[PDB]
Amino acid sequence: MENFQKVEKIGEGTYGVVYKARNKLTGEVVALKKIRTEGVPSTAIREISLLKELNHPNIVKLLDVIHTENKLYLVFEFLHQDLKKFMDASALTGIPLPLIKSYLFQLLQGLAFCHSHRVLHRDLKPQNLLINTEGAIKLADFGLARAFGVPVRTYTHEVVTLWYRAPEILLGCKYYSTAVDIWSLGCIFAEMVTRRALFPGDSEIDQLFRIFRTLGTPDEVVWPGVTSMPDYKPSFPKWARQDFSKVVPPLDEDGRSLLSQMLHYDPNKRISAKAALAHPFFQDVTKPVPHLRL
Ligand SMILES: NC(=O)c1cc([N+](=O)[O-])ccc1NCc1ccc(Cl)nc1
Secondary structure, three states, X not given: OOOOOEEEEEEEOOOOEEEEEEOOOOOOEEXXXXXXXXXXXHHHHHHHHHHHHOOOOOEOOEEEEEEEOOEEEEEEEOOOEEHHHHHHHOOOOOOOHHXXXXXXXXXXXXXXXXXXXXXXXXXXXXXXXXXXXXXXXXXXXXXXXXXXXXXXXXXXXXXXXXXXXXXXXXXXXXXXXXXXXXXXXXXXXXXXXXOOOOOOOOOHHXXXXXXXXXXXXXXXXXXXXHHHOXXXXXXXXXXXXXXXXXXXXXXXXXXXXXXXXXXXXOOOXXXXXXXXXXXXXXXXOOOOOOOOOO
């Protein structure tokens, strides 16, 4: 590192390996992601560079985009833990409702900000949500999907998680909208509540059918235009919708109501982040401190 000092290898992101590193000069501790290939598309560097100006308290700060030696590195502010690890650590007792609500409220503020600036995430998941000791939670990797390209694999034959993908993406829609992020966040909200992934599909069709088995196979009534989607097949089985009370028990009606609006099939009916922030569920929102063991 011409200016760093790898503290250790965090993990293996969807784009490349991620390291915790310390800037030798400033002494700042950061997350360094080496991006995956043979020249680095100039189209990508310009788009990524624009994300440096996208700051909000609930968005992981992109500190630098380094294009040198024909390689691409992204330098991000560092946070000590992700929501996936936190949920596993809170598996026995569950994350307290006040903290679940605080986190959801903060993530929606983060999404409202990105979306108002025409920036989508497209691949939200527990591992991309970072938390600190102060009770803050932040979204990591916003806009990388568009700037770069389709995921599929990390960089070393690793299985892409489809659990949080919106149905319109699974049905082959080529144009993503802000709604895909709201869907993923609804899936995460449900998971924090029940302590089990809502739709743990192990293939694109299994993912789609797990959604259908729970929310009902969509039709033209609830989702105008669904039967004309690229990958829609008239042969899809027709499952009846399950009662929401059985999906995320023992969540209260305010919570179930908000979740139902975040999981509407029609992306156009799906609630926006701005509107979700005003939902009665957040009437008593607070900002608790989590018990974090680092
Ligand atoms: N910005 C970051 O700090 C960060 C970035 C990526 N990533 O993919 O670019 C992954 C995890 C991250 N932190 C959470 C974390 C998790 C585990 C450990 Cl040991 N230490 C920190």
